[PDB]
Design a binder for this molecule. Structure first.
Ligand SMILES: [Zn+2]
Length: 46
């Protein structure tokens, strides 16, 4: 039985680059901004 969430869902809104968990999905939406300028983690490097 390959099933997923049988019971309650899950509130986990992690970022993309930094992959930071944000209890609130909205808060993250705005946070993502931080990744728009300096060391945005776009071009492969480091
Ligand atoms: Zn982030």
């Amino acid at each position: 039985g390959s099933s997923g969430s049988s019971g309650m869902g899950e509130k986990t809104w992690k970022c993309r680059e930094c992959d930071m968990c944000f209890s609130q999905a909205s808060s993250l939406r705005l946070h993502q901004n931080v990744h728009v300028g300096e060391k945005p983690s776009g071009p492969s490097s480091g």
